[PDB]
Structure formats: C-alpha cells, structure tokens
C-alpha cells in the first residue's frame, strides 16, 4: 500500500483527479469505479476542471459506482444516481449509457445485485476503483463483519453509517436503512485502488488501517491484500496515525 499525506483537502483532490485522469488517458476505454459522499467532491470538481484546462476527454470511458441506497429512485435528490449526474456526468463528454449504478428501486434487489456483479465482470472489471472509508472502516457499504469474498449484495446499514450520512437528508427518519453495494471481492478485483481519506472524523479509521491488522471487523483492511493501492490522507485525517 502506498500512503501519501496531503497538506490539504484541495491537494488530495488535485492528486486524485490527476491519477484518475492518468487512467483515462492511458486507456480511453477505461472502466472507472467511482464513489459518492463528501470525500470525492473535490476530485470530481478538479476532473471537470481538467476537462477545460487540458481538454481531457471522457468520450470512451465506462463507469461503475460502488453503491446506491435501497428504495430511492434515480431522480431522488438523495440517490447516488442523482449525486453522480449532478457532480460529474452532466459536466463531461461521456456516453451517458456507459455510466452504471445499482438500481436501488428495482423490484427484486437480490436479482439486481446479481445482474450488477455480472455486468462488472463483463466490462473486464475496473481499471481503477475510487474508494472512501467509513468512520468504522467500511468500504462501499461493506460494514464490519463482511466477508472478504463478498460480491455485490443488499446490506443493512450500520447505525454509525446512518448517523454519519444524516447530514445529507431532510431528517433522520428519511435516512435509508438498506443499500446495494459492490462487495469486497468486487472491489479487490480492480486493477488499481485509490482510497481517499479526509478530515478528523476519519482519524481513528486511518490509525486502524495503518496499524495493519487484517480482519473482517475493519473492512478496509482487506486492501492490505491488494497489489496496487494508493491511499491519500489529509493532515486532519492523519492526526492519530500510529
Ligand atoms: O461507498 C461509499 C462511497 O460510494 C462509502 O464507503 C463512503 O466512501 C464512506 O461512507 C465515506 O463517506 P464520506 O465521508 O466521503 O461522505
């Protein structure tokens, strides 16, 4: 694992956007695994900037997202479909039909997860997979206790995850209880992983990640088993490192 301390969130975002841009330009038909949440917001903003300042093209890219909340339609402002469209897809010259995200509003969520996993395989897996980290070490919505062999599946969100994400919802009662997520094995199949970590809320998770104990109780520890992981950590997130 390569760990890079960044002075600021803005520097983390610059470096992340550059690494993602590198993947896109080396392989214009790259498959990018993407993430939502607060952490990658700056990365998407900087990618869009590079679209202007460097004439960076997204025309032949395919993307797959980690996760989607169960029970939300694509037009719901709290869906990850909406997030990706608003923060990214609307601003780039991609082919819209090549952006894939699990359908949290499907009638049979188990079947949706099986089809999604099958799609990711058919794409040739991801060329790069962007990740964030939960306060509890989750990756995607693979909560503590998830098998490292897990594939895309329906999960019941831990209360800590609902507590963390409540900031984005009108009320605590609107925060979904379940989600669809790429599994740990789905993530580990990527050619390259880029884990982004920002802010004091993640400092305990950073400490656990860097201490290097490998176990299902801390999902992100699965990344110690991958051959090409880069972890970008800002100063605030690095404050409790061992
Ligand atoms: O799957 C995802 C993102 O698609 C989640 O694992 C988040 O990365 C994590 O919950 C951190 O969220 P933020 O702190 O970035 O809001």
Swiss-Prot record:
Record keyword Hydrolase present: yes
Catalytic reaction annotation: alpha-D-glucosamine 6-phosphate + H2O = beta-D-fructose 6-phosphate + NH4(+)
Activity regulation: Activity decreases at high substrate concentrations, which may reflect substrate inhibition. Unlike the E.coli enzyme, is not regulated by an allosteric mechanism.
Cross-referenced InterPro entries: Glc/Gal-6P_isomerase, Glucosamine6P_isomerase, Glucosamine6P_isomerase_CS, NagB/RpiA_transferase-like
Top-level enzyme category: hydrolase
Binding, beta-D-fructose 6-phosphate: 36, 38-39, 67, 138, 140, 167, 202
Additional comment: The gamA and nagB genes encode isozymes of GlcN6P deaminase. The majority of the GlcN6P deaminase activity during growth on N-acetylglucosamine is provided by GamA and not by NagB.
Role description: Catalyzes the reversible isomerization-deamination of glucosamine 6-phosphate (GlcN6P) to form fructose 6-phosphate (Fru6P) and ammonium ion.
Name this protein carries in UniProt: Glucosamine-6-phosphate deaminase 1
UniProt source species: Bacillus subtilis (strain 168)
Lineage, highest ranks first: Bacteria, Bacillati, Bacillota, Bacilli, Bacillales
